Design a protein around this ligand. Sequence first.
Ligand SMILES: Nc1ncnc2c1ncn2[C@@H]1O[C@H](COP(=O)(O)OP(=O)(O)OP(=O)(O)O)[C@@H](O)[C@H]1O
Ligand SMILES: Nc1ncnc2c1ncn2[C@@H]1O[C@H](COP(=O)(O)OP(=O)(O)OP(=O)(O)O)[C@@H](O)[C@H]1O
Lengths: 311, 311
Amino acid sequence: TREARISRAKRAFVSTPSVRKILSYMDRCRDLSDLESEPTCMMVYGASGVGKTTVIKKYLNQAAAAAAAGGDIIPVLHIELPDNAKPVDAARELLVEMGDPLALYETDLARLTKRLTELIPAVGVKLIIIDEFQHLVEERSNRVLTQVGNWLKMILNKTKCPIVIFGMPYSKVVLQANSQLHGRFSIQVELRPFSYQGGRGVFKTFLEYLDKALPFEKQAGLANESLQKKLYAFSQGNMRSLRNLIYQASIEAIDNQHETITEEDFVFASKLTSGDKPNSWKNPFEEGVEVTEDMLRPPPKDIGWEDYLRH
Amino acid sequence: TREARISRAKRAFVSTPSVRKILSYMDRCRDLSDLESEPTCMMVYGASGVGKTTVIKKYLNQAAAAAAAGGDIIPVLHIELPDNAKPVDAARELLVEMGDPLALYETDLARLTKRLTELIPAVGVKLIIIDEFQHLVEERSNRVLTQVGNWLKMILNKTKCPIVIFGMPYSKVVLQANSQLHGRFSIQVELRPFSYQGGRGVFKTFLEYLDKALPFEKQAGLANESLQKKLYAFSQGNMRSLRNLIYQASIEAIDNQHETITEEDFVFASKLTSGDKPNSWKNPFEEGVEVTEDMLRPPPKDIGWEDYLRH
Ligand SMILES: Nc1ncnc2c1ncn2[C@@H]1O[C@H](COP(=O)(O)OP(=O)(O)OP(=O)(O)O)[C@@H](O)[C@H]1O
Ligand SMILES: Nc1ncnc2c1ncn2[C@@H]1O[C@H](COP(=O)(O)OP(=O)(O)OP(=O)(O)O)[C@@H](O)[C@H]1O
């Protein structure tokens, strides 16, 4: 098995230009906010499985590895909002995250704000990052709760720490609720999936950078004339499922004697990870499924919005 | 009676490949976690009576027999969470378990964390194992409490000891509560019951290894053409009830003159241990009950989830 090759095949990262555009903007946000005056407050979108958490873990690596190895400073922070977040609920988890506090046996929402606003200059927080903004909409109706939104405006105007919010593409109507939240968050971006399969794409260079990143030491055989056809036939532009199927083929090749990912084990990888796909999506690998041109069609605009049509 | 034969008939263990897969993964977790950097933190599932406690007692035998006979080291630990566990409640029982402390007349949850984090390198804990993770969901509603979850993340990030959590299959939504708990627990497995009765199963080899493991010195007569039919008719794939009925037949055979388990005393064993079964489950042994093919049907996916539908 040689589990080093397995973990080294799973932990692989390809920097598409949108990702480095993002990380450049967050360093821009980090040492552009001067902690004297009003911050910049970027907002990042992206659908399910487009690489968001990988982006922020890249960011806390390249921004906080040496400063977390040096001492208890914690300049950048990483937060997910729990579902249907009460303002005291999000505030207390954001508080027990940073520092070494006890911090949550009292739930009073004024005195823990006191403790968090005295601690946010005490350890020297350079940036606060929130992962999951779509948790503030109701399940069965599309009312949105902005107790946490006005609380986040309060902690923004209290201490001038920059905030970078990630979230689903349907989570922006929450920002359409509070207009002061809408104006305070100026930079919204678009981390949409891979667009086309027609040729000379960013998809190409991503694919062959992943190919040299793979643990097989000669060639992976991928990013070819017909392979990206069935690859884009399998995953829409969907980064998580593409990488998942690729990893599930790579483990199958390293289970036995195999020199590269080839045409006997990539099929069984299509057999496993075909579960999340819809019924009208077509299964292209086993016996005779040639792929029409309309099925490599680019992803629509409401690609991170199908959590929202039904209600 | 000859109670040696009774205890030697009760304490019998058959290593199906999923069990040795597990124990290989926990030795992998034990001396893969280096106690310098971030651990691996496996999670194990399994329904009621699938052999979990037997697996961990096998593990503390084969991992800690000689080191517990040598001195007070206690490298591996065994913990069950009490029901509706307060963080101080789970922490104090995890504390009085290891070492020889007094440890629970104070319930302060900061200073006992102090004592436990100075003691976890003092005795040299190699691994902490928790049995019962399903105790953190509410009875009447499906709110889950994650005071203990964030406390377990705290003790995970404080000292870098690997943690192996066992639990019910419906207990994974608790891990879906905290996303940092979800990401910190990477390896989740599937200890599901025995799948089919159709032939050439793992069930076969398990059955005849149990047959040679039985105290009768010629043959047990089991694992035959028609016996596994009524065996899988009695127990679904359910290891506890299968082993229980087998033991209740073996005691009945050794109560009087009997040379093997046979067709007069195995019936009375079906008479006793038919209580836990549902009403629509069919009782197949007494007079004329031939078993249809649909009743050897494989167990469903929500087989460890019927504690969860009603609320
Ligand atoms: N730039 C990249 N290069 C290689 N693999 C990537 C890249 N970005 C993401 N992946 C893969 O995609 C998978 C999904 O990542 P991630 O969870 O960050 O997406 P996401 O949009 O945050 O999904 P979710 O929002 O549901 O968490 C990861 O397992 C990772 O291996
Ligand atoms: N590999 C095995 N070989 C033989 N017997 C076994 C094996 N595994 C389990 N058993 C039998 O199954 C019974 C139930 O064991 P165990 O309690 O570990 O299951 P469990 O899933 O932990 O149940 P619970 O979770 O309710 O404690 C035991 O009495 C044991 O005799």
